[PDB]
Amino acid sequence: SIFRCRQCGQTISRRDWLLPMGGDHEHVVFNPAGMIFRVWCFSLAQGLRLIGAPSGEFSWFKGYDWTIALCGQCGSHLGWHYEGGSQPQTFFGLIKDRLAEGPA
Ligand SMILES: O=C1CC[C@H](N2C(=O)c3ccccc3C2=O)C(=O)N1
Ligand SMILES: [Zn+2]
Numbered sequence: 001s002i003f004r005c006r007q008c009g010q011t012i013s014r015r016d017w018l019l020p021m022g023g024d025h026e027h028v029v030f031n032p033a034g035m036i037f038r039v040w041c042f043s044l045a046q047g048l049r050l051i052g053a054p055s056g057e058f059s060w061f062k063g064y065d066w067t068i069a070l071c072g073q074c075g076s077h078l079g080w081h082y083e084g085g086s087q088p089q090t091f092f093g094l095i096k097d098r099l100a101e102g103p104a
Contacts, residue, residue, distance in 0.1 A: 003099045005047070008074040012099060013045040019091050021061065026096070029060045038096040039079065045092045047072050050081050061085070061093070069094070 003013045018025045019041040027039045039060070049072040054065035064082035069092065071078050079094035 001102070002104050003094070003101055005071040005074060005076055005078060006098050006100045007076040008071060009100075010047045010071050010073040012047050012071070012078065013042045013092070013094065014104075015101075017042045017044045019043045019088070021091070027060065027093070032058055039093040040096050040099075042092045042094060043088065045069075045094065048078060048081070048092075049075075054083055056084075066093075 001015050002011065004011055021041040025041050028036065029039055030036050048069045050067045050069055052067055054067050056065045059066055061082055063085040065084040066080040066082050068077065069079045069081050070076065076098060078098050079092060081092055083090040
């Protein structure tokens with residue numbers, strides 16, 4: 001039920017906050033460096049630190065701009081925050097294998 005940073009245990013999100021974007025909460029995507037990510041969409045997350053300037057470039061989600069999301073405690077790269085779009089305006093795309101799932 002709770003998702004934590006795999007690298008240090010920081011509390012990050014909850015299964016109840018999962019967001020089916022375009023029919024599914026899971027999107028399997030590649031970046032321009034050839035890396036594949038199983039991205040889980042959450043409406044909400046906490047314990048992150050958002051870095052940099054939002055960008056539209058290479059966005060996997062049409063109409064959204066992204067910012068890198070680090071674990072706020074250890075600095076692990078956990079995913080991205082998306083903003084600037086519609087229904088919803090914002091959400092989080094977190095990398096599933098960088099989280100640990102467990103009891104509340
Ligand atoms: O929606 C997104 C999030 C950012 C992500 N991203 C990467 O992970 C990356 C690595 C190197 C150069 C450029 C990028 C890029 O835009 C990506 O490709 N799309
Ligand atoms: Zn961490």
